[PDB]
């Protein structure tokens, strides 16, 4: 609820520490889920689309495919 | 239909020759290539057809003579009227050659279809020319075969 665009980005540039916290997170997201949260934060897109390209492209969609949701029927 | 609260003058004039809104085939538009006059025109002719009863899926071929002739300030309506009387007598409905790419706005007007090339038909029964002018000067005429 309290989220606002470009939050903690000022502190980002100014703090070599926080700088890296974000980076490691982004680095992660990009290489696994195929997007940057830093981007989403800086400029809030009304939409965004990830692409399952070559070698590291396919490995991403794997993670999208390996997302296990769970709802049981009214019989059990 | 003269002053009948239960008959639109459009209905009237048409029904007196045994026709309904569905028989109204071509609408010649003022369509002056200005931003607003072209939204508006569609919107009016559209609301017109809808509220009268025009059956969904039956579009009017829309003509825009101005692409070819330019806008002769006053004689605009006359040129268009000629066009329709001519369509009436040939069954050919001329296309808007300069229809680059119709504005997405014009999608919401179901009852109007904007032809970019001429179409030879089995015939047209009745048409509607419509022009608008400076100082809230709107006119419309319906012609029957």
């Amino acid at each position: 609820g309290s989220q606002e665009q470009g939050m903690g980005m000022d502190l980002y540039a100014t703090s070599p520490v926080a700088k890296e916290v974000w980076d490691r997170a982004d680095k992660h997201f990009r290489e696994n889920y195929g997007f940057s949260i830093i981007d989403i934060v800086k400029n809030n897109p009304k939409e965004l689309t990830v692409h399952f390209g070559g070698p590291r492209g396919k490995i991403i969609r794997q993670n999208y495919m390996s997302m296990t949701f769970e709802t049981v029927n009214a019989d059990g | 239909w003269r002053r009948d609260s239960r008959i639109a003058p459009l209905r009237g004039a048409l029904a007196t020759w045994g026709l309904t809104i569905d028989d109204l085939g071509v609408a010649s538009f003022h369509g002056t290539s200005t931003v607003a006059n072209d939204k508006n025109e569609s919107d009016v002719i559209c609301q017109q057809l809808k509220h009268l009863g025009r059956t969904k899926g039956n579009a009017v071929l829309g003509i825009f003579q101005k692409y070819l002739t330019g806008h002769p300030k006053g004689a605009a309506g006359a040129w268009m009227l000629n066009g329709c009387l001519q369509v009436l007598n040939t069954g050919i409905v001329p296309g808007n050659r300069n229809a680059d790419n119709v504005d997405k706005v014009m999608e919401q007007f179901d009852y109007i279809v904007y032809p970019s090339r001429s179409i030879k038909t089995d015939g047209i029964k009745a048409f509607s020319v419509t022009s608008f002018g400076f100082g809230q000067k709107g006119a419309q005429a319906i012609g029957v075969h």
Partner: protein, 48 residues
């Protein structure tokens, strides 16, 4: 013609050519020998 077909017919061209003043009718001697019909408005010459 233009609004519908997108080009002039010979009939069209002749009308345009007439009103634009490019050709005019002639009915007398052209260079001695008689002639009647379309003539280039600019040069007295005849046109088919």
């Amino acid at each position: 013609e233009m609004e519908a077909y997108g080009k002039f017919s010979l009939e069209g061209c002749v009308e345009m050519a007439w009103m634009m003043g490019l050709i005019k009718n002639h009915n007398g001697p052209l260079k001695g020998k008689p002639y009647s019909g379309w003539v280039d408005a600019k040069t007295g010459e005849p046109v088919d």
